[PDB]
Amino acid sequence: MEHVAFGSEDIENTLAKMDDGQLDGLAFGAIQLDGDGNILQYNAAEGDITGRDPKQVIGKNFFKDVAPCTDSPEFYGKFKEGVASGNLNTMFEYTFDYQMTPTKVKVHMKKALSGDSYWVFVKRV
């Protein structure tokens, strides 16, 4: 395992050192998005939660293509305000229900330490 707790205050500094292989050792799902919502990184734990194959969703748009259930003011709306503002740090519960059994999760969205990238972290509840 990589030992990093979900919700940790300095998580963006810790994850700045990991490559795709290290990200697969986290105890929670991790997605890195660009400012348009395209998927740059997608770890093994996220694929275990949602059924998606990580290598197949990299490059797709999360809000348009992969996760239309998140295209709502409650999820995408928060993301886009964060990108526009250049700051984002929010945690909320959500249900993922597209082409899968409805699954309740906790989501943490946080701006990355690098400029135009954003993390989405997911764990079951």
Ligand SMILES: *C(=O)/C=C/c1ccc(O)cc1
């Ligand atoms: C709603 O459409 C949610 C879909 C979804 C969430 C998270 C993922 O990693 C993949 C699909």
